[PDB]
């Protein structure tokens, strides 16, 4: 289990005619693991503040707002909110 | 059968992300929306880095991203540098 096939699908969406080396794809996969863990650990700390046994979209969203720099955070929240709204309406 | 990724408009794997969230015991349980939200955020960040790294590849007269393109794209971006740290090659 890695994110690499999914990274590759996103690469071809944003740059249809640009490829990627093995080591570059390793670096990309490591970024996704690193941010996954940062956001999961912050979500864990928030859930404890709230005495909450479940991590929900509310904790992920707050984790994104605290961990990501401001402009990336604003756009990431827009994307996460959009995906959950599309999922709920499917 | 229709994937949670497909329902959410995503490429990133919602099911796999849900499994990683549950496996790590960040809390007792994980809600249905949390993995969708997190998958969307990780997909957005991948797209942002790939956009900038691929622009660096092309500016560098290449047709594929190598580690130095990622290093340059990230080092030239205040926010990605803050989030991801220095890329070491």
């Amino acid at each position: 289990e890695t994110y690499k096939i999914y990274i590759f699908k996103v690469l071809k969406q944003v740059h249809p005619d640009i490829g990627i080396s093995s080591k570059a794809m390793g670096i990309m996969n490591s970024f996704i693991n690193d941010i996954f863990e940062k956001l999961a650990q912050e979500s864990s700390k928030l859930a404890r503040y709230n005495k909450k046994p479940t991590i929900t979209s509310r904790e992920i969203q707050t984790a994104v707002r605290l961990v990501l720099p401001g402009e990336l955070a604003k756009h990431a929240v827009s994307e996460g909110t959009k995906a959950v709204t599309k999922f709920t309406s499917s | 059968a229709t994937s949670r990724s497909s329902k959410a408009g995503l490429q990133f794997p919602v099911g796999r992300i849900a499994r990683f969230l549950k496996a790590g015991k960040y809390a007792e349980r994980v809600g249905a929306g949390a993995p969708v939200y997190l998958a969307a955020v990780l997909e957005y960040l991948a797209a942002e880095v790939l956009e900038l790294a691929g622009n660096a590849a092309r500016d560098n007269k290449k047709t594929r991203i190598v580690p130095r393109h990622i290093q340059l794209a990230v080092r030239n971006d205040e926010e990605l540098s803050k989030l991801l740290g220095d890329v070491t090659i």
């Binding site: 690499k4 590759f8 490829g19 990627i20 080396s21 093995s22 080591k23 570059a24 794809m25 390793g26 | 594929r64 580690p67």
Partner: peptide, 7 residues
């Protein structure tokens, strides 16, 4: 080596 090949 492996690194330098295409993904």
């Amino acid at each position: 080596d492996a690194d330098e090949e295409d993904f």
